[PDB]
Nucleic acid binder design. Structure first.
Lengths: 386, 136, 78
RNA sequence: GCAGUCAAGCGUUCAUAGCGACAUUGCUUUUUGAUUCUUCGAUGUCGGCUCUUCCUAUCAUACCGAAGCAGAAUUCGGUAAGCGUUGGAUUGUUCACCCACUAAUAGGGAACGUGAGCUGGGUUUAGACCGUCGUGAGACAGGUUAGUUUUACCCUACUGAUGAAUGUUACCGCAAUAGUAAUUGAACUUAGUACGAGAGGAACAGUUCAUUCGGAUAAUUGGUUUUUGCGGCUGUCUGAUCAGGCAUUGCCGCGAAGCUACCAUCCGCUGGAUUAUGGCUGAACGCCUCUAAGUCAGAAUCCAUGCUAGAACGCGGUGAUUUC
RNA sequence: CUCUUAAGGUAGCCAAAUGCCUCGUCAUCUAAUUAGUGACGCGCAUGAAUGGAUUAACGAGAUUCCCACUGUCCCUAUCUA
RNA sequence: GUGAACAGCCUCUAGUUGAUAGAAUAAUGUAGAUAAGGGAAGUCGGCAAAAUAGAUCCGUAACUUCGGGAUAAGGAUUGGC
């Protein structure tokens, strides 16, 4: 029969399977189309989600009721310490896709990136890249020829970087490693840029800039085995319902005499790798600066870090990216940012943004004050203080 | 929404589904209004059409003049009592739900409005802005 | 952007923080939290709540704001 | 039920803009019957709720063609089933009938989908009332009231989750295959302009917003409270106090964190090949002709980009590879 | 006026738990009512201890509406054992 | 003891401390609860739940078999010293 009242599919059949991701670091499945004219820089960065705060700014939209009027918005903060470059590899093209033929590494690998190659570091000779390190020290022989191989082939070049996890307040010590595709020009120049940057760091100011729209790629918060009602968004069945109401009543018809893939079933919720686009950068911030949270209008020397810290993360003593809105992932999670795959004008991706004020009040409560000095000047002296 | 709408409106949270009753803030002789439709509302299964501050609705009068009772008429919501967000971050609410009687192209059957009204309604209905004293 | 003041507790309200209540008499109260909003709806008096600026004013706590004025002692000199 | 052929006539004039009698050819199986093949050592026989998918004979939306199409609204028709198709009063109702919104409120199928998914209002046991019929026991697709809805722990399928073997082990990756998602509308301006005697009255581009859907998130607001966190209150018990027990979380208020809501916030890509249709060149048919060769543009179409998994028997690169 | 019966349904009551046609007709209740109530009555097939018509109080009886109340619902979320 | 009360709640005398345990705290359940704004739009049907509740004072209709209806409806107060 001819369903009595039509209505749309609950859920998206394109974010299937709603399965746990293979890694905690989501993988960039598409970098931007290249231009062989620009200089050489990266297309992505790695950071760690810290949390959120609140942002006030004057809006610039010729036609809105709130034009040249102050609106408050939500942003998220990505701790983005300088990222170290260790190696590149060369992907060449085949009728079976792109394929790597060489991985060139650097001589001195740090003890926070040569832990990524171990599952038990505390008992080990650490014996990694020891022979690849002695592959140097004869002038450039076995390394320069590999790089020449890359230049002679390799329509695509990718740089292997690792995070400086030891600068964050996390207790992990095991740096995240990742390939990032260069979209400069002259693959020779690409690999030469890489070779110059081996054992050296790239800051995020060199990649991103204010008012730049980006995409965030991260593994989303895990919630576990969930039922169909919250996982897919189905109706709760009524109260007078035997054997449960948080279910899907009819899971198919007699013929086709099978349960279909299109039917809402119970299972994993979260820990999916998601990719969310068109998130404007509202600030690119430096850890070589107090007054990261100060502005042109506020001018109070405060960091971006709220009072009591960011909840479950800590402080932001490094550089950071303050980007509009909510992004995939929970705090303490490795995010990978990506420049956009297309130029969006749209009169909202071109709005030039200047912040007025930033909320540094505690997110561990209904925080009253933004600053301990504000707090002291309001409350006055207390029994503790002299 | 529609005919007498001077401009657009940002989304603000829904507080007045059909079957709801809100007081009548004008002097047309009606004491309450009973909401039975919302102009501009979509169509989802089992969803109730629901009105917000500034929305136009179809109403009946339950208490008031017999000249007005027992017929459906248009109306406008001027107070919500649900908290709604303004883009300047302000969450705000009134202590009561209220509307006025009106014609389809925006004019009021009354001459005055008791109590405050929302700026999101004054912006969208000027005849409500005219006969409004206090706009918040 | 202004920093409004809580109509029950005298706290400072920063943007996007708290609520606003418009009473039928068109008076606007501003609350920094659900605590002070709830005490308002429970129609308590802030002069009896011990953590409020109004109480502390009424009871002279942190009362080093204004002290006194002098008395005039001088000739006309003209 | 639906669609064709023919065309006497209606349509001011005119058969075929739109309709179309007398006749006739057909399709379908969402009607009702006919039949009795299967099932009586039982396939749980109404309806709604819920959920998915499919069809197209397309209601709306995209692009078009024709008009008895000036504009506006409307009618006919094509490609198209991509995406949508509601809220309620009454009724058990399917059907129906009205109120209202809407872009529209299209029709159907899946054992007349769906009862180890619900419910059980109806029919269809046993109780009981009425009316008619019957001498009567009792009968009545005649009304009325009350009337037990069992089992999954097996196999498969589905949703998720591990895992032996490929020298071991670890890191970075490719991407066959499969899936796929965005949708619709209003206001301003275009412009009281075009059009039209006037009444009336558009459209493209642009801007701002919203509807439906979806994926995240929790700064804020709200909700939640065994933080049994802080306070308060009752009754009793610990001789009083202080501090506490019991009241199956004793109750009240506030309540961080976490979870969470169109009850909150953010986000939701741009390129190619085509359909219908309109065209170019251009014969066939010395003319003409979008067509036959060839070719242009072009839809919400299709394929990619992008997005989701990653073949546990698809692949690659790289690091380190055990001696008493 | 006529046929005719043993007599030809009186008082009352009614689309009633009894009315097929039937979602009867008018009104009222509703924005909208096959529901309800009040009226009408050629009543397929009401009706007088087969008891008829009423009826205060009573009813785990059937039924409609109003107020209040609410997670029944919009629309779901959270918490404890 | 509270309290109208062999109500419910705590305690003395007496009696038990039995009922397979441990570890975690996923869905779905069972039992129990809470919920912005709305307020029966849900459903055959307000099923279920909520709301009300004691005592004192005030006030109390239609109808009636004059006995009732009646705690009608509906309002206010309540602690400690």
């Amino acid at each position: 029969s001819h369903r009595k009242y039509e209505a749309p599919r609950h859920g998206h059949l394109g974010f299937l399977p709603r399965k746990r991701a293979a890694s905690i670091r989501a993988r960039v499945k598409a970098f931007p189309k290249d231009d062989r004219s620009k200089p050489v820089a990266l297309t992505s960065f790695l950071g760690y989600k810290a949390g959120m705060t609140t942002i006030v700014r004057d809006l610039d939209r010729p036609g809105s009721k709130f034009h040249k009027r102050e609106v408050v918005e939500a942003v998220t903060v990505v701790d983005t310490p300088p990222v170290v470059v260790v190696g590149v590899v060369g992907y060449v093209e085949t009728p079976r896709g792109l394929r790597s033929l060489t991985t060139v590494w650097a001589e001195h690998l740090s003890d926070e990136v040569k832990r990524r190659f171990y599952k038990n570091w505390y008992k080990s000779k650490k014996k990694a890249f020891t022979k690849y390190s002695a592959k140097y020290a004869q002038d450039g022989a076995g390394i320069e020829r590999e790089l020449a191989r890359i230049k002679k082939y390799a329509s695509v070049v990718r740089v292997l970087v690792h995070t400086q996890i030891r600068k964050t307040p996390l207790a992990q010590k095991k740096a995240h490693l990742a390939e990032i595709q260069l979209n400069g020009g002259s693959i020779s120049e690409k690999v030469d840029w890489a070779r110059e940057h081996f054992e050296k760091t790239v800051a995020v100011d060199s990649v991103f800039e204010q008012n730049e729209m980006i995409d965030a790629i991260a593994v989303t918060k895990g919630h576990g085995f969930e039922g169909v009602t919250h996982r897919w968004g189905t109706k709760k069945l009524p109260r007078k319902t035997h054997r449960g109401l948080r279910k899907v009543a009819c899971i198919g018809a007699w013929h086709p005499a099978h349960v279909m893939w299109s039917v809402a079933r119970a299972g994993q919720r979260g820990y999916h790798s998601r990719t969310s686009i068109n998130h404007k950068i509202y600030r690119v911030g430096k850890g070589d600066d107090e007054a990261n949270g100060a502005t042109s209008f506020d001018r109070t020397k405060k960091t971006i870090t709220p009072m009591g810290g960011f909840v479950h993360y800590g402080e932001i003593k490094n550089d950071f990216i303050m980007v509009k809105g909510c992004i995939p992932g929970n705090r303490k999670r490795i995010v990978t940012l990506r420049k956009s795959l297309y130029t969006n004008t749209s009169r909202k991706a071109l709005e030039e943004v200047s912040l007025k004020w930033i909320d540094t009040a505690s997110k561990f409560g209904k925080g009253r004050f933004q600053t301990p000095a504000e707090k002291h000047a309001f409350m006055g002296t207390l029994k503790k203080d002299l | 929404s529609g005919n007498g709408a001077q401009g657009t409106k940002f989304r603000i949270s829904l507080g007045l589904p059909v079957g709801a009753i809100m007081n009548c803030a004008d002097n047309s002789g009606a004491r309450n209004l009973y909401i039975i439709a919302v102009k501009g509302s979509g169509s989802r299964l089992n969803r109730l059409p629901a009105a917000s501050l500034g929305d136009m609705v179809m109403a009946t009068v339950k208490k008031g003049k017999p000249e007005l009772r027992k017929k459906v008429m248009p109306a406008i919501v001027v107070r919500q009592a649900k908290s709604w967000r303004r883009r300047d971050g302000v969450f705000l609410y009134f202590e009561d739900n209220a509307g006025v009687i009106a014609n389809p192209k925006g004019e009021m059957k009354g001459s005055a409005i008791t109590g405050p009204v929302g700026k999101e309604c004054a912006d969208l209905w000027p005849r409500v802005a005219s006969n409004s004293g206090v706009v918040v | 952007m202004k920093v409004e003041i809580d109509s029950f507790s005298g706290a400072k309200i920063y943007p996007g923080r708290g609520t606003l209540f418009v009473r039928g008499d068109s008076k606007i109260f501003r609350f920094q939290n659900s605590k002070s909003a709830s005490l308002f709806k429970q129609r308590k008096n802030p002069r009896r709540i011990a953590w409020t600026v109004l109480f502390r004013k009424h009871h002279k706590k942190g009362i080093t704001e204004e002290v006194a004025k002098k008395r005039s002692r001088k000739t006309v000199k003209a």
